[PDB]
Symmetry: C3
């Protein structure tokens, strides 16, 4: 056992949404659990800055989070949106190899674009935002696994995009941004 | 392994939907399986009374199921919609402690009874109702974890809401209400 | 430790979509993982023929994949769309019984042919098709478990239907068909 790799259940601000900001402005909860040959994931984002908490005063919203991992499955905090590495739920040890939680590069390879679409690397789904007035808006989610390699330090990529394209803005005031839990599963690398 | 807590796979009527009814009018199927630090859930409701089975003669419908558990994860039947406790897929010395199946009070705390606060305690999704003529209608699902205590004897809360908001009612006659299976995952309490 | 039954992560053409074709024209990725009392599934289909890769030149499309298994959970290749049996992620043989990965016939019974509706044998959901120009199209998914046999040699049934009813066709030329990953869970038979 050490079948759960996660941010903790109620993390402190650990992720930067607003490009260029130097400190965290949001709280990413991300949990990756092994289950046989797949990983089951759970992700939710909570805003923690006035900028993130006023994004939903606009009708068109896109939130992006990119995670870059090294060869042993550890976050590269300089290029990732998440600035703190994930940790095993059972283990005080940070000494561990997390390759087994990573997205398979056999199912979801890195590719060089070379005229021709490569859409095997995406998961699509939906999650929701509940506004201040009670209205519920669907958020379209895209997860991309591996596919584009940005540098030589990276071995695995997991990116998230939440998009809202609404008839009218959900809010007219600042309100804590919370994306409802989005679950997904993917084929995992060997341990 | 002490890892599945459920109603059974095809339960007899075990749940009360209609306000003020004294005996079960529906069959709730609920399965909670441990997977690392999360529980994976599966839930479906089947009507077993004329009242439940004529709800979809209206175009706007809300079905509420509330589950209140004690400190060792057992159902409190007086206040809960479900009138029979859940059971382990494998049998009892003292019946048993089901606390590790419950929603985490760290991830999903109990909070003051203020309106519209703490929307991090909800999971939103969709499942479907297939009408007698074949039309498929989406049902918006809300699951509430903990958040509001109903009384001083409860330790954990899990509530389900299925909502239909159609342009035209699905049915014009009585028909067996069946919600298609809804899956969800949540951060679990320690064993 | 033999909890994954699958096609492998990047299968050769192994499925026949087009009516009356004798050899595979598509690549079905199917992974069934035990988790306590349920199976967690992941399915995606990739086209592998000009026929399959031109279906999305029409706005209305139905793709069907039917899997029929014998009493030990192995594919009957003659009748099924999948022509190669599933394999354990850790084996090598037919030294494997796969009944524990099958859909429970208590939760999803077989019923008398042609007598009633039996919507409790269906799981409905959505996945997507990303077109060559980038637009995302929702695909409605229906999974049927057990319910009706194709012949008297079959013990378990799992069928998938992906449907598109767009306002306009996704494509005007041939393009690799890919159904984004669809996850679902169901109550499993005993091992």
């Amino acid at each position: 056992k050490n079948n759960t790799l996660w941010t903790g259940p109620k993390p402190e601000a650990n992720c930067i949404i607003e490009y260029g900001k130097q400190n965290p402005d949001s709280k990413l909860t991300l949990i990756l659990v092994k289950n046989g040959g797949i990983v089951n994931g759970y992700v939710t984002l909570m805003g923690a800055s006035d900028y993130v908490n006023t994004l939903f005063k606009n009708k068109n919203v896109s939130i992006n989070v990119e995670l870059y991992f090294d060869a042993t499955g550890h976050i590269l905090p300089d290029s990732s949106s998440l600035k703190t590495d994930l940790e095993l739920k059972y283990k005080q040890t940070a000494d561990f190899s997390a390759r087994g939680f990573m997205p398979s590069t056999t199912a979801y390879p890195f590719v060089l674009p070379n005229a021709g679409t490569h859409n095997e690397n995406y998961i699509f789904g939906q999650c929701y935002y509940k506004a201040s007035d009670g209205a519920l808006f669907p958020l379209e989610v895209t997860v991309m696994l591996n596919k584009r390699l940005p540098d030589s330090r990276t071995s695995y990529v997991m990116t998230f995009l939440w998009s809202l394209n609404a008839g009218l803005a959900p809010e007219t005031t600042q309100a804590t941004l919370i994306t409802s839990p989005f679950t997904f599963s993917y084929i995992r690398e060997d341990d």
